[PDB]
Specification:
The chain is mainly alpha-helical. The chain contains nine helices and three strands; from the N terminus they run αβββαααααααα. Helix content is about 65%, strand content about 10%. It has a three-stranded antiparallel sheet with strand order 1-2-3. The structure holds chloride ion (2 copies) and xenon. Pfam families: Phage_lysozyme.
């Protein structure tokens, strides 16, 4: 298991524009296109992202490309963030993947705001962090996914994904 496979599981793969768990226009492997209610707008962002007139649909390869770029940007964002990087460098490889997943889903800004969980993770207080992480909107809105990420932080193994 790796970051790519883990997110491909959490996110799924869809070749036509769809709305995510929050009602926003997305395509591929959880690639958010826009928060705008407009489908034209979503189509417009898509075409710009792909470099062609896609008309709302893309190929598997195009989807994989976006995903690569998105995973890359997520790591980069973590490494460029002063509240995140330290946590991330302090973690083992499995738990780093959990942190990337959250960033991919919620943006760096949003993850940087879990101050207390970030500190517990940094101190290696696994159970405590897992309890604190669940006290969140993220956990109440997408509980299944959140449980898998949380278990990963708690155990440092990929069991939630096996
Ligand atoms: Cl893009
Ligand atoms: Cl979920
Ligand atoms: Xe976190």
């Amino acid at each position: 298991m790796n970051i790519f496979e883990m997110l491909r599981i959490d996110e799924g793969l869809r070749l036509k524009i769809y709305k995510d768990t929050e009602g926003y226009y997305t395509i591929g492997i959880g690639h958010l296109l826009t928060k705008s209610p407009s489908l034209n707008a979503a189509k417009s962002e898509l075409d710009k992202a792909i470099g062609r007139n896609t008309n709302g649909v893309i190929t598997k390869d195009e989807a994989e490309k976006l995903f690569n770029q998105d995973v890359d940007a997520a790591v980069r964002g973590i490494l460029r963030n002063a509240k995140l990087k330290p946590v991330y460098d302090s973690l083992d490889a499995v738990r780093r993947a959990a942190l990337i997943n959250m960033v991919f889903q919620m943006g760096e800004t949003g993850v940087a705001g879990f101050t207390n969980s970030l500190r517990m993770l940094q101190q290696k207080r696994w159970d405590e962090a897992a309890v604190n992480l669940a006290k969140s909107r993220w956990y109440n809105q997408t509980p299944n996914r959140a449980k898998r990420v949380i278990t990963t932080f708690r155990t440092g193994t990929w069991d939630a994904y096996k």
